[PDB]
Symmetry: D5
Subunit: 156 residues, 10 copies
C-alpha cells in the first residue's frame, strides 16, 4: 500500500460518519473487528483515522457499517496520524492518560534507561490492549498493556 494522506480532517470526518452508522446499527467495536483477524484496538484505531486497514478488512468492516466505495478506499490509505484536537485532550477519559505522563513521564524514562539503556521504547513496533478485570476491593479495573520494542541509541 503506497497511498497516504496529508490532511487528517478527511479521515476524521469519515470517522464521524462511521460512528453514526455504528450507533444507528447498535454495533460494538468488538463486533466490527470480529472476523478480520486483527485486534480490536488496531481496527478501532483505523476506523478513527489512526491506522490503515488491509483491503480484506476494509471490505469486511465496510459491509458491516454500510460504507460507500470511496470510504472503503480511504480506510486503506496510510493516515496523517494524530487524534488529539489541540495537543492536550479536554475529554476527562482521554485526559487521564495524559496525566499519567505528567506524573510518571520521567519515571518511565528513568526505568527504561535503567533496564534497557539509552534509546526508546517504540510507538511503532508496538501493540496495546485493554482488559477489564475485577477489583478485589469492589468494582472493576482496566489493565492497559503497552508493549513496545526497545531500540537502542548507540554512538557512530
Amino acid at each position: 500500500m503506497i497511498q497516504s494522506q496529508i490532511n487528517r480532517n478527511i479521515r476524521l470526518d469519515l470517522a464521524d460518519a462511521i460512528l453514526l452508522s455504528k450507533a444507528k446499527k447498535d454495533l460494538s467495536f468488538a463486533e466490527i473487528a470480529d472476523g478480520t483477524g486483527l485486534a480490536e484496538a488496531f481496527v478501532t484505531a483505523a476506523l478513527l483515522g489512526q491506522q490503515a486497514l488491509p483491503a480484506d478488512a476494509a471490505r469486511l468492516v465496510g459491509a458491516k457499517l454500510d460504507l460507500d466505495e470511496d470510504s472503503i478506499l480511504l480506510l486503506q490509505m496510510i493516515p496523517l496520524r494524530g487524534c488529539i484536537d489541540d495537543r492536550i485532550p479536554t475529554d476527562p477519559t482521554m485526559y487521564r492518560f495524559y496525566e499519567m505522563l505528567q506524573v510518571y513521564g520521567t519515571t518511565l524514562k528513568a526505568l527504561v534507561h535503567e533496564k534497557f539503556g539509552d534509546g526508546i521504547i517504540s510507538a511503532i513496533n508496538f501493540k496495546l490492549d485493554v482488559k477489564k478485570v475485577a477489583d478485589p476491593e469492589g468494582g472493576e479495573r482496566a489493565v492497559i498493556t503497552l508493549d513496545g520494542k526497545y531500540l537502542p541509541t548507540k554512538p557512530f
Copy 2:
C-alpha cells in the same frame, strides 16, 4: 501527611541533587527501592518529585543516597505534580509515550466506554510497572502495565 507543596521547582531541584548522588554512587532505582516495601515505579516517581514517601521509606532512601534532613523531609511532602517542562516532551524517550496518546487516545476512549461505560480509567487509584522481556523475534521489549480503577459517570 497534611503538608503539601505549591512550587514544583523545589522538589525538582531536589530530584537533580538525588540523581547526582545516585550517579556518583553507581546506584540503580531498583537498588534504591529495595527494602522500602514499595514498588520501584512509586519510589522512583517520589525521588523525581511526583509522589510522597512515607517517613520510614524517606529515611531509608535518604541513608542510601546520603541526603540531608531538609531533603528527607521534602520527600515526605505532598508534591505539586507535573514532570513535563512545557506540556509536550522534547525528549525522544518520553515523547514516544505522548505519541501513543496521539495515535491511540481516541481508541482508548472508545474501548473504555465499550468495556466499562461512561466514565474514566483512574490515574489516581492506579499502579504502573515496567517489565523487560525478550522480543521473540530478537532483542528486547518493554511491557508497561497501566492498572487503573474504572470510575463511572452516572446521572444525578
Copy 3:
C-alpha cells in the same frame, strides 16, 4: 451506553440548535429537566454536549424541544467532553469561575490535602448545583456547591 463521540463539534452544533428551539419556545432549563428525574445541572450539561442522557430522558426532552430522531440519539451518546473553546474562557460569566481557580486553586489543593490527605476531589463522582439566595446587604448571591468524592493516592 457503549457508543461514544470523538468530535465535540457534532454535539456542540446540536447544542446550538437546541438553544434556538428553546428560545423560540420560551423554555427554561428547569422546565426542560422537569419530569426526567435528573438534576437541572445534569440535564443542562447534556443539552450543551457534556453528558449523556438515558434513553427515557432523551425522548422527554426531545419531545419538549421538537428534536428529530437523529438528535434524540445523539443526546444519548457518550460525549467528547470539553465546553471551553480554547482553554481559557473569554465570556465574563464563565471567566469568573476560572479566576476563582487563579485566586484559590493552590488554597483548594492545600486544604484538600490537609482535610483528606494526598489525592484528589473527583470531577467524575461529582454533583453540582446552583442556588439563588438573598444578600442581607441587598441584592442576590449564587451559592454553587461542588460535591466530589475524595480518592486517595496511596503507595504501591
Copy 4:
C-alpha cells in the same frame, strides 16, 4: 492599605518559605488561622500570595511561623494575584477543578443567566469553604461552596 505588588514571584517565594517553616513545625492551615478572626480559606490564600492580611493577623501568623519583619509586612501588601504557573494546572488535585469548568462551564453560565439574568457571579464579593463529609456509599466527599454576589449587566 495602599501598597501593592507587581511581580507575583516575591510573594510566591515567601509562600515557599512559609510552607517549609509550617512543615518543620508540623502546623496545619487550620491552626495557623486559629485566633485570626478570618476563615481558613482566606488566611491560607494570603499565605500562598493571593490575599492581603490585616496587620493584626499578619503579626499573629508571623509569630506562629517565625517570619522576619519584612515577611510580615509583605503579607499585608496587596498581591499580584494568579497562583497557576502557566494557565492550566498540571497538578492532578488542582486540575480536577479546571476539569469541572471544562465539563460544566457552559452549564454554570446558562443556569446563572436563567436564575439571575445577564451578568456575573462575583469572584471578588466572594466566599469559599471546603467541608469534609461522609460518602453515604463509603469513603469521604468534599463539599466546596462558592458563594458569590450576583452583579447584573444592564443597558446604558
Copy 5:
C-alpha cells in the same frame, strides 16, 4: 431575559450580516442607536455580539436595518462574549487599546489600589463612551471614558 448563547460564532455571523446591511443603507452606529434610549456604545456592542438588546430596542434596530425575525430574536439573547479572534488583536486600531494595557496595566492596578483599596474596577457595572475633540495643536483626539464601579476585596 433568561435565554443565553454558548457559541459566539452565531452572533458574530449575525454581526457580519448587520454590517453589510448597514453599509448598503449608508447608516452610522449613532443613527442606528438614535431612538433606542440606549448609548451608542451599548447598542453597537449588541450589534457586534457583545450585549443583549431589550425587546423594544431589538425591534427598532431590526426595522432600521431590515433584519428578519430570527435575527431580532438573536439580538435579545444573552451572548457568549469575547470579540477578539485569538486573545491579542492583529488590527492596528484595536491593538492600540491592548498596547495601553501593556504600558499602563500595572499603573492602573497601582493607582486603583491607592485611591480605592484592594479590589477591582468593574467591567460589568460599567459604562464607556467615545468623544471626538479638537487637538489644541492641530487635528483631533479621542477622549474615551471608562466608568466602572469599585468593588472591594474584603477578608472573610
Copy 6:
C-alpha cells in the same frame, strides 16, 4: 536621552526594589509624583518600568525613595516596555481592563472609524488619568480617561 533598554527585567527588578522602599516609607504614588510637574500616572508608570523620567524628576523621586545613583540613572533610560508577564493578565484588577477589550474592542474600532475615519487612536500621543467619584446609588466609581490623538490612514 538617547540611552535605551532591551531587557525589561532590569527595570522591572528596579520596580520591585522601588515598591519595597515605598512600602517601608509608607509613601503613596501621589506623594512621590508631587513636585515633579508630571502626572501621577506618568511618574507611576516610570517607576514601574514603562516610561523614562527626565533627570530632574529622577533625582527628586530617587531622593524620596532613597535610590542609589545607578537606579536614578536607570529610571532615565528609555525602557523596553511591556508590563504584562505573559500577554494576558492573571491579576483580577488588571484583568478587568483586558475584559473591557474583549467586550468592547470591536465597538471601539467601529466608533473610532465612524467618528474619525480610517486610522488609529494613538497610545503614544496619549494621556490617561484615574479619578475617584461617588456612586449616587452607593459606593464609589473610577472614571478612567484615555485621551489619544487620532492619526489617519490615508492612501499613498
Copy 7:
C-alpha cells in the same frame, strides 16, 4: 468612509477570488494599480484585505478584475487588518521579513531612540515601496523602503 469590518475572513475570501481572476486574466499588480493614482503597494494591500480603496479606485480595479457590486463595495470598507494566519508566517518569502525583526528588532529600537528619541516610527503615517535593482556582484536585489513618521513620547 465610516463603514468598517470586524471579521477578516470576508475580505480575505474576497482576496482569494481576486487572485484567481487576476491569474485568469494574466494581470500584474502594477497593471491593476495603473490609473488609480495610488501606489502599487497601497492598491495591492487593499486587494489583499489590508487597506480601503477610495470609491473611484475600487470601481477601476473592479472593472479590470470583473468583480461584482458587492465586492466593489467591500473593497471600500475599512478592514479588520492582519494578514498573517497565526502570528508567525510559515511561507519562506514572508518569513524573511519576520527574521529581519528577530535579528535587527532591538537594533531598530536602539537607533530610533538615538536618532529621534523616545517614541515610535509610525506604521500608520507610513509608506513602503519595493524596488528591483542590480546586485553589483551579479543577480538582483530588493530595496524595500519603510518611510514612517516619528511620533515622540514626552512626559505629561
Copy 8:
C-alpha cells in the same frame, strides 16, 4: 571565526552590561561604531547579541566600553540569533515593525514574486540602515532601507 554560541542568554546578558557601561559613559552607538569601518546597524546589532564582530572591531569597542577580555571574546563568537523575548514584541517601538508585517506581509510577498519571481529576499545577504529626514508637513520621518539579495526557487 569557527566558534559559535547555542544559548542566547550569554550574549544577551553581555548586551545588558554593555548598555549600562554605554549609559554611564554617555556614549552613542554612532560613536561606538566610529573607527570600526562597520555600519552603525551592524555594530549595534553585534553589541545586542545578533552579529559577530571581527577581532579588531571587538578590541576597539571593548576598549571604549571597558569590557573584560572574556567579553571581547564573546563579541567575536557567532551568536544564537533572536532578539525578541517571546516571538511578538511587547515594546511599542519594536511592535510597529511587526505591525508592518501584519499589514503588508502578503503585499511584500506578492510584489516580490511579481518583480523577481518565485524565491525570497534574503535576510542574510542583507543590509539595513536608518535615516532621519524632515517631514514637509512638519516633524521628522524615519526612512528605513531593507536591502536584500533575491534568491530564486527553481525546479530540480
Copy 9:
C-alpha cells in the same frame, strides 16, 4: 510566473483532491513525475502545495490525474508555503524529522559555522533526495540528502 497565493488552504484542498484521484488510479509519485524532467521530490512537493509547476509539467500531471483547468492553473501558481498544520507535526512519520532537529539542531549549527563560517545553509537554493538502501544488519534504511548552498553572513 508572477501570480502567487496568500491562503494555503486553496492549494492544500487541491492536494486532497489530487491524493484521492491518485489513489483511485493506483498511481505512485514516481509515476506522476515521470516524463516531466523534474525530480520526484519537486513534483510531489508541487502536488502537495509547496512548489509551483511549470506549465508543461502542470498539464502533463493534470492529464494523468484528470484535473480540471482551474486546478491545472492553480498548480502553476506560486504557493503560500507551509505544510505543517500547527507548527509541530503530530504524524509520527513527519515528527521524526522534527525530532532530528530537537536532537541535532545545535550540532548542525555548530558544524555549519565550523566548516563554512557565519551564515546559513539555504532552504531555497536546495535539493532534496530520498533513497532506500539495504541495511547490512537486516532491513532497510532511508538515506535522505539535504543539499543546500552556503550563504555567508559578513560585516557591512
Copy 10:
C-alpha cells in the same frame, strides 16, 4: 550507562562552559572528536547535551577542554534531549532546517510511504553527516545526509 537526567538545563549549562573553554583554546569540534573513534556529529551533539559519551571518550574530550570531574561524569549521563529553546528556532541557521520541514515535510512522508511503506524513518537508529562541497556555479554547498532505519507499521 544506566544513569539519566531529567532537567536539560544541567547539561546545557555545561555545554555553555564547554563552548567558552573551546573558544579560549581555539579548538574545533573536529579536533575535539579526533581520537575518540566517534563521528564529529555524535561527539559534538554530546558536548551540546544531546548524546551520552562513552567513558573513554568523555575522558579524552575532558582533557582537551580542561573539564572538572563532575563535568566528565555529566557528559556520560543519558541526557534529557531537546536542544531548541521553545519549539521553533529563532536562529537563522537552525531555522532553515525547520523551514525544510515546513516545505518538504509532507513530501518526505509521501515518499517514505511510497518507497518503504507505512511506518517511520528512525531518528534513533540514525546517523547524520555534514559535508562541504564546491558549487559548480560558484561558492560552496553543504551536503547533509540523514541516514535512518525504516521501521514498518503493520497490523496486529
